[PDB]
Amino acid sequence: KAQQEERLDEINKQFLDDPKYSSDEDLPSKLEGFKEKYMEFDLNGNGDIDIMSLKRMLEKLGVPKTHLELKKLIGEVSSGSGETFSYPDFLRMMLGKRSAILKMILM
Template sequence: MATKKPDYQGGKAYGERMEMLSKKLSDINEDFLNDKDYSEVEDLAEKLTQYKEKFLEFDLDQNLEIGMMAMKRMMEKLGQAKTHLEIQKMIKEVDTTGSETINYREFVLMMLGGKSTILKLILFFENIGRAEETKTGVPPKRSLDSLP
């Protein structure tokens, strides 16, 4: 199966850096795919791909961690602006290492886990909202052959 190579803007060095980061996250995704605890998760490979893309989008300093400012930007972009105290609380709900950031493994565990966090809910509903785009314009002409 051929995978589509991402189109990164910013020059050769930036593209190489993003490829390296993407590879590291893909390796973590492989761990989840091979973990028997997650074998029952429906569409796991597809979900992990979406999580990787979302994580890379908001990893501002490209250190494979989402910190305070990256989280603030993420919430603002999703239309859910939060105060610094609210952001700190959201990070603490997910952070298992005490780093005061969210690494990719913690991010995936949050999204796949049963614990409902504010961030998980926002990302979940943001994804649902995007899937329900309505078509606009003139409907196509129908004939008797197209009826069910």
């Protein structure tokens, strides 16, 4: 938990130096806030967010979603084999010009 944060920090540093996101003057503090938002979710053994974790989080936001709807949400932001999405997946979505449904829900 607090351990997995170490990895999130390394990723934030990686993104901080990414020219693709340099135009955002508030990147330094935003990445930290996004990290905190990500850590509100239950993170699995690999530090990724799964279906039940997403379900739990959306419940807290008053946004109930069906099992299949949860699959659609993750499948939209996941860079791997649909089922879970990572922190890097999360940042590219939160940043990035395209607006995934999960991004609109969370922001």
